From TrEMBL, chains A, B:
It comes from the Eukaryota. GO terms for biological process: spermidine biosynthetic process. Its EC number is 2.5.1.16. PANTHER family: SPERMIDINE SYNTHASE, SPERMIDINE/SPERMINE SYNTHASE. Pfam families: Spermine_synt_N (PF17284), Spermine_synth (PF01564). The active site is at D156 (proton acceptor). This is Spermidine synthase. Keywords: Polyamine biosynthesis, Transferase. The lineage of its organism: Eukaryota, Sar, Alveolata, Apicomplexa, Aconoidasida. One of its GO terms (cellular component) is cytosol.
Length: 281, 281
């Protein structure tokens, strides 16, 4: 009979609500408040510090686009790193690539992983894959200490207010750059084009200081504020990430629900007002 | 201090809210409840029967895509009809085309037009243009009686529950077909791909019974349910509406905020799950 409502100073004057069928789990971890409920129409929902992280109904949009964009552009990715993303959605999509031989994930809050393993089985199933290696720690420290370099890095970031506050600066992007192969790619969750173009501009500024090609793409997802979210795309080659190099025809990919070859590049076709805001950058 | 919340049986278990800065006007017209408020962050907002029709912050997305898609594909449109759309957003975009010589609009609720003329001046300004002719009546009757035929028809429809219930059937689309030139185009507001694919499927079914090319496109707009809304595109030629035939370089179009040449076709690149749902149709 009651409703969950998502408020935040990051999007003042607006809110999105889901009808709660039953509350499944709540706790205060070392790092944040965790809530899991079954919604009446979006299936199960994960909330962190009062911010919706995912729902069963639409998470495939975010996880597919964040993963298959960089992974269909990298020629033969062997070693992939996911920053954040304790829920495992990125990992699930990554395991689909039989040519990947190692997936490292760095998540600061193991509670997120554990909760996901219990309540979101079709999302966290990737954890059962032998290539997957979990590191419970601060992304900044992980990046400073790792000896390996990666073909792809996916910053499945979480909002700038909270634990992911540190994932939104100039020091962080150089660490990413150094952790990548010379032909390596990073994609990062970047805020909605409707809410904070100031943030998007800033992220693109930091990124261009290092990467030779920085592009921005948009994903339609109803349970993120304003119904969409961006992908900050960083490339070491000047070819960038707008055009896939391969088609996903293997039986592993026959279940995809959002991503395909055409909408990969389409996602980079932005509203006129945004294109205008993003140069002289 | 208080909030407007958009509930509906058309999207159960979800709701979108805007913080109200001040309520500007309310009435019960012959046809529906009308509310106009100044929101704290989306500017002024028009509500009909508790459903958000537009806000100043983002209406340009819907009005630009609905208008400039069909109008950049029609070779030399002279006579255009807008069904519904008493707010005048479509009309504003249409007047930008100096080659148009007549714009007919059929709106059943003159209160909508009057309210818009008073509270939404930068949206309803098109009404001051001499080519514009207003008809206060039922779209079905208007379409049955009009002697002229149109190059383009834009069904700026309103949701299936209420006055626009009649704009969602098989009789209505034949009337549209007969009212169009042999090479004429219709575009119609069609529901969100996240909420009702059943409706979208039905609309496409009705349309293909008459039109030789029926395509579907998506618009990102945060203040419609799920943050996007579709355009049902109907063509009499098999060439369809995905590719513009002209660029909007005239000084009339230099102010566009969403539409451009590339995102015209991009908008037709749909999520894999939808493409799959829409055939065997």
């Amino acid at each position: 009979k009651k409703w969950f409502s998502e408020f935040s100073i990051m999007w003042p004057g607006q809110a999105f609500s889901l009808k709660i069928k039953k509350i499944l789990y709540e706790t205060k971890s070392k790092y944040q408040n965790v809530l899991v409920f079954e919604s009446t129409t979006y299936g199960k929902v994960l909330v962190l510090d009062g911010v919706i992280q995912l729902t069963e109904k639409d998470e495939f949009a975010y996880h597919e686009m964040m993963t298959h964009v960089p992974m269909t552009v990298s020629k033969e990715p062997k070693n992939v790193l996911v920053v954040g993303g304790g829920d495992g959605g990125i990992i699930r999509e990554l395991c689909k690539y039989k040519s990947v031989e190692n997936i490292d994930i760095c998540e600061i809050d193991e509670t997120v992983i554990e909760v996901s393993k219990i309540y979101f089985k079709n999302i966290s199933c990737g954890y059962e894959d032998k290539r997957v290696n979990v590191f419970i720690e601060d992304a900044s420290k992980f990046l400073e200490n790792v000896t390996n370099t990666y073909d792809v890095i996916i910053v499945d970031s979480s909002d700038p207010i909270g634990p992911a506050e540190t994932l939104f600066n100039q020091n962080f992007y150089e660490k990413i750059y150094n952790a990548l192969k010379p032909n390596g790619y990073c994609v990062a969750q970047c805020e909605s084009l409707w809410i904070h173009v100031g943030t998007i501009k800033n992220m693109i500024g930091y990124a261009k200081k290092l990467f030779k090609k920085v592009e921005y793409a948009n994903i339609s997802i109803p349970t993120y504020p304003c119904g969409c979210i961006g992908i900050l795309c960083c490339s070491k080659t000047d070819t960038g990430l707008t055009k896939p190099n391969k088609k996903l025809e293997s039986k592993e990919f026959a279940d995809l629900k959002y991503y395909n070859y055409e909408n990969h590049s389409a996602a980079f076709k932005l509203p006129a007002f945004l294109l205008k805001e993003i140069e002289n950058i």
